[PDB]
Amino acid sequence: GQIIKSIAAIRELHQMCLTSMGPCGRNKIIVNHLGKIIITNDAATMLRELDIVHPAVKVLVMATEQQKIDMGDGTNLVMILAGELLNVSEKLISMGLSAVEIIQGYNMARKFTLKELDEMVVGEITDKNDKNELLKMIKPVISSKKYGSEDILSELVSEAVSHVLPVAQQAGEIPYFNVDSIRVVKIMGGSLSNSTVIKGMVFNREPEGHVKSLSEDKKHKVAVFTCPLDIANTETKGTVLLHNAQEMLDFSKGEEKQIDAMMKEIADMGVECIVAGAGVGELALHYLNRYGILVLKVPSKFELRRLCRVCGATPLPRLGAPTPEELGLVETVKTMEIGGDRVTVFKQEQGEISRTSTIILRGATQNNLDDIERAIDDGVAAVKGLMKPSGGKLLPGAGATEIELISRITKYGERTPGLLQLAIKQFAVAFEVVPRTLAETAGLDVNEVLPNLYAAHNVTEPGAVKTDHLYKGVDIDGESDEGVKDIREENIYDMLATKKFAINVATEAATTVLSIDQIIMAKK
């Protein structure tokens, strides 16, 4: 009976995910052995910080990572649904039904579900990229994570997406929106209402110079220099030493005249910003103050990649060769105080449209500060799902999808004769865990909300054409209500690309566990 105990080991981790999806979800504090606390609400990121022992759970963890890499959303739907398929299959194994026909039954039920997803599409996203149109897709992503911030964070995320996207329609050949185009930064102090949207990267460090900001001139030239600032010498060794005091006057004045000569040629070309990836000497900062050149140091090589796609600058392996062809252009750069400290940000005006934006977060809570940082990353991948593979189609969410599939699957159960009826019926019952989870965690009675969900999708209408309301989902209440309410009032929908991809992954996840009747391992 090892296959039964394997489900019980997953059942211990199943209840952990039942308290994740929904508005009742909470982040988990994990103390690493290196003395670092990583806090995230996302389940896929949580599995990376957790050490999995039993390899049977690793199959579900590897299936969860598939949801985060491609579609980036729906990781809670994959893990919870795959865990319920093992519970409904436990009764079939104990009943005497072999696991061979159980696996074959899921393959027939999966093909029947994918064909019905096209007829369940309610609305169609026009991909207008409007600020008001993006509020419908982003709202359910922020929902079931952090409560109360769905109204404020909806306008901040939707505004940054429209800045990095150009103007185009009905063209899917050339991709535009990437996953790195949206960066999230954090700073101590402020609130959510005072947060703004920046059209470019935000630098929270100090300029390290007496020049606070550049002028208002159009098309500022920005040059990225990987070579550090110093007098040109031999690449091999070349350490400056003083044998006697006579050579001190020649070596000291030589470094001052050589650096000043290189900065004069760069300032004449119209470059007001010099980006030095390496360290900057003491005498180099003295000449940059009189020429009015902004001092910027970016030691991280990851930040220079997204900078090349905005202004068009290119890193130069040498120093003192301001090639105008590889220089970048930015409309306006300003240094303002955001969050209590004066920092130099990066933005634009009209031309040189930036392909990367950054949203600044402000708040007095440290725990909820990193919560929004990890929550926006789940919303970034939602924009990627708007492409050709079923980006415009959408399905109603809030538990309305899993309940509606029950009536369609059971209708095809009696149509297919043979032993396949056992796996088809249990496949639809496994969808009942989603509506029960939201009602149990929210404190709603099972004897009340649950029977009203079945009566919402099942009614007696004297006619062939459907009518009344098929959009009624699972309601969290929170104030008062009688029965359930329409989901179309809050406009909470789920994309087809997210739901269709989550079904195929969850189906193959439970297939691997049921197919393994023996596990052989050894100590390390």
Added chain:
Amino acid sequence: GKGQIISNINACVAVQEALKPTLGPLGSDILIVTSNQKTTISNDGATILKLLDVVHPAAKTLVDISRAQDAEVGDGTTSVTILAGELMKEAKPFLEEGISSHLIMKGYRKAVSLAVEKINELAVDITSEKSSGRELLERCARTAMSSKLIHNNADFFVKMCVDAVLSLDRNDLDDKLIGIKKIPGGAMEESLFINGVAFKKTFSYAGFEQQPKKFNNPKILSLNVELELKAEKDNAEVRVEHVEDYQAIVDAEWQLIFEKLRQVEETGANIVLSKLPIGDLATQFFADRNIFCAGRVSADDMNRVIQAVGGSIQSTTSDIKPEHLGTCALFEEMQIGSERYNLFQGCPQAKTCTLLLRGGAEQVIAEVERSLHDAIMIVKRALQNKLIVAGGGATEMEVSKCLRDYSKTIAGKQQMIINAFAKALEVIPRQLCENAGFDAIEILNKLRLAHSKGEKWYGVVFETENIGDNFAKFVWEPALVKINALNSATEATNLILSVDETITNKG
């Protein structure tokens, strides 16, 4: 599982139980022993809780909200931790009957919306009405000094406290700008208020330094490095090939320092300070020029001198520019405290001051030092924030009243939750009575009598046990405390009660 929720509630009770006696000026103090063995005793809950470093994850939330309580507000760090923990203790029996935690946590935020609108109705903006500039600071100073050993000597202490905040900007005020140094010995009523900075008199050795301490207009100059010859610690070894050359080896420091001896004479700076110990070489030439200098100056002491005359620190004495110098009105070093302590007076540009205290023991002054900080925080928040509410249990007892009537009009499970939320608010006035020795059973029962008569200003008298009004007792608290505490306690309460699992990795 469900057992982790109960285990997390009792884990916060052990931390809350220590913070209960620390509520109030007359309450008990926690004795904390750091790994460094340094012993610190104070009644301020901020520094206390920061020294616990509890491994339990939910206990870290109390530390996070304590930093925001001390930063944005600065007062009430003890009450915000007790109020946030009391809501979790009252919700323990509610979870054992099958009630989900989400309904209980949601009911807390329902009373928060009614509490924000209640504070605005209880906030009265008054400045010049029925008061003045001097009468406002004088009447509020004797309130924090009551029920203390300084109550008899408070007549001279209030006059020095009024002029303390007047020497600083009224728009921007900081409690750290007024320093307090413990001086053992002497009477407690002989202390005075000084605009400058004082030293610790670390030199117990005798036999030099004759000089009068009365100066007219000394010039202040900062020096970033130590300039000295005689050194008590290290020594120099000399081995060469000549007998007569043993002397000149240690003299390498002469010429460049010999020139710097007369540079101060040409500059005319009468005050020389450094963060490093200075030998007797600098104190040599300064005698005839009437130049005062003090060695082994702390790093925090020089930062207050730079902001005094507006000068700046320079590494050497050569390139010092004339704008780095500064001059005060008068320099007088008296024997107050049974020891000569240097001080500055008459600096118009000084952004900081120092309040000296005297007493027979250092522990007696430490009790007075923490008591004077409470009177400063009241004036600190009375300037920028114009909304003043009645504290000391007055507003606390009013919030619980109205919330009991609002629950009767709200059908559903929120009725018992809001009623329990207002019932948990009674821990604040209770603990204040237990710390002062007053009986919390009789007072809280008799206070609810007149509390329902329509007057919302009834407080708790901290001097003699009885019901009364804090308006006559001059007990005031800013409205920022009540707003920030209810928002931080509700967020911290709902964060811990929602924890279904405690995960800790070892390695």
Added chain:
Amino acid sequence: EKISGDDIRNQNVLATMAVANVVKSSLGPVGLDKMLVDDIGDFTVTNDGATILSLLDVQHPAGKILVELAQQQDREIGDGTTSVVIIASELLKRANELVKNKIHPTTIITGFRVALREAIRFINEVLSTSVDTLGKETLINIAKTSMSSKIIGADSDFFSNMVVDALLAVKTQNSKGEIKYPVKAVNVLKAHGKSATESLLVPGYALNCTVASQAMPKRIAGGNVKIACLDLNLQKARMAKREAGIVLERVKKIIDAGAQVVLTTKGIDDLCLKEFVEAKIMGVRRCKKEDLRRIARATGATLVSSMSNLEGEETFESSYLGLCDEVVQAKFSDDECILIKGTSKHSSSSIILRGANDYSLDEMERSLHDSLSVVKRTLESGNVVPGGGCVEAALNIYLDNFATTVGSREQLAIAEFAAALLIIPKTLAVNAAKDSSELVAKLRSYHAASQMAKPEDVKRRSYRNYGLDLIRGKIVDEIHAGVLEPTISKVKSLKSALEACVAILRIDTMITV
């Protein structure tokens, strides 16, 4: 051994907790039966919680106190024993929590005694007699819910109007205005006439019998008539002109006394029947002995044992003859009955239930007496109170503001005593599958606004007596719902519950050899 301190105080709570769990599921009519298994291996099946506590074996000083408390209510009231144990169990749990608050037990005891006398005065203010007789219906829904388990419950709507109107007039002064309803009255007959819903109420006594020979008139003496009840027959007497001459004198004392109605248990012969034709006297053969004994009380007559008393023989004219108005006989289907109305003093009536067959009427007649038992016991006491949680919920809110009127360390004891009454509706809703958190919470909101305008002697939408109906799952008034309880049962149950709670809290030491 000798124990003391907080250890004995915790054992008292753990002892009453296991006892309360036994009566927790048996509270109310929705409760379920339980089994008691001894060391012998036998068991029993009963739904009564009072019989469980009698055979309950528990070794504990405070546990044995509840044993005598359960038997005290059974020997007198016999109802509400389950509710008393639950109240006394919650009072001990909340009293132990006050130990950490440094609350003295005597103050807890004094706080209960002062609140107990003041609670009775508050209950006496909301007490009311039977009302809503015109325009509304009260006693109708009592028999309707009791018959819901029988077929008669479908037709109980039409049958309740005949039973309530009958029993309403049955009350009489008894001895010095007692107004006590009898335990057995309103003899129910059966007939096959028409359907079950065609039964008609007869305001008076009804006897099932025939006239034998039909030559006698069925209606005579409209103005005044006298009924002669005689257990001795008028038929010729046998052993086991002498025997024929005795019955001739017995009839002579009848026609001379002016009795138009003659009832004989053993029948009347044919010779004595001929004399009744010329006198228009209606004879009845084969009377029931149990029927005629009740006629003497309804018609004011007296049963005659024998006519051989002393040396005389006669019917004692005018002594046993009662005052009646008219005796009318209507033709009925299947068996025919006799209608007697307008007697001297009767105040009673008879309900003849007609139906399809006698097989269904046998189950309806037995269920009618069981449904009447609940009605006659409620109407026995003129002072009644609505149940279903109306006593505990209305007093909970009143003691909140009333605790401030006394004070002096006794406010905390009153608050814990008031909140301890919410356990009765809580555990009652458990067996009804309804959520106990929603029903108890929403019940306080309705009673909160009910007492706001009560002392002002003015009201608009504010009503009192809000109950809890667990059958339909809605909040309705228990007066109209059909749930009513006497005041004597509630007062003695609440007072005796606190008597056993005081003796438990006063024990600080347990000495066992």
Added chain:
Amino acid sequence: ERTTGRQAQISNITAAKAVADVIRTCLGPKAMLKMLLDPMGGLVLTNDGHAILREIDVAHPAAKSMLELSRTQDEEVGDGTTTVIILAGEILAQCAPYLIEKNIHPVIIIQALKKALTDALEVIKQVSKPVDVENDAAMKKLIQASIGTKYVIHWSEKMCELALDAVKTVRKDLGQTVEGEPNFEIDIKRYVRVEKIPGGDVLDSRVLKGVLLNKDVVHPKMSRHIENPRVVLLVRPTLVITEKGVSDLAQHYLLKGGCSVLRRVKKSDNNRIARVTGATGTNCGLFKVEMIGDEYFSFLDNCKEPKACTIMLRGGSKDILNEIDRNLQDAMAVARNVMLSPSLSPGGGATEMAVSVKLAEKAKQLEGIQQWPYQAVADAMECIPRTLIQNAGGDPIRLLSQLRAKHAQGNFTTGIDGDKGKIVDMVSYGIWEPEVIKQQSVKTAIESACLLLRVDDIVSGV
């Protein structure tokens, strides 16, 4: 001592389930034998469930309540004792995840079982087919199911005729809308009680209406034929019957009165005399005292049908009549069920499957909280025919799904055959069972399953 919380509900389910799971092999003609280990060297080799359950020692009181149910069920009908226990135990098994894991209130389950009990009886009545109760040749085949494969197979031709007249004697057909439905007032225990007389013949054995006594006339010369004999129990009666003995002095006193003295009469037989007579004896049919089988008899019969009598059994020896006793009583239980209603039900598990199919389709239209436990009842109704499949060697997975699909197309009378093991029709192949057993199996199992869930705590005490 005491069990509280959710653990008490699990102990109540597993108590009756552990007993029902063991007796699963006692159902059907293919039922496998069982072996119990007694402390004595003997053992129980029979497969009868009524004999095995009485010898099993149980601990939890829920199993004791299941034993009392088997005793009551065995008195009503001869067979089907294990069917009631298994059906009542499987319902608690299917409701185990709903009561524990799903956290469903037990009264909701109990209230749903009461509603499903009415719907289960209406489906069986529709599946049942009409049958003629007045046909003497048809009643012999209905009883033959309990005759063959037994020691009476040699007398089966005579047993079907003897069991027919034995049932026809106690039954009387009366009905009307005036006094209601008497339901024939048939009692096997008291009225059908039989007396075994050694000697005689089985074919010549007849059923006499009355009480038979072995005491003869107490006088040597007396009239053995009376026109209108009058039975008097203890007017100038024609007969005198005394419960106790009578001295010879009273013989000459009552001799001139024209009456016979009969002493030594049992007390239990006096109650049955009141049915043929009415004495607390006119119109008495036959007074003939003629000896039959070297034993003096008496005829109390008449021209009327009191529905009370003592059946006289005769055979080749006492050992033969002893086996006829339990065989005739079990055979009349099937014939009694035919007179309770003119309907028959398909055997082999077809009736069990007919309820589960109609319950799942009707429960979907109610749309309420009771809908979930209805699916657990339909699964329990399918375990009875599936249990026979496990004993028939066939695939329990394949034969269960293929049989359920045939109900949506074909009729509900198609069961499972024990001899073959494949899905076949019960009506065409001559497999029938009475409906009364089906009504008593569903009603008593649901009523007993609800009582086991009503006890949430085990109280220990005297």
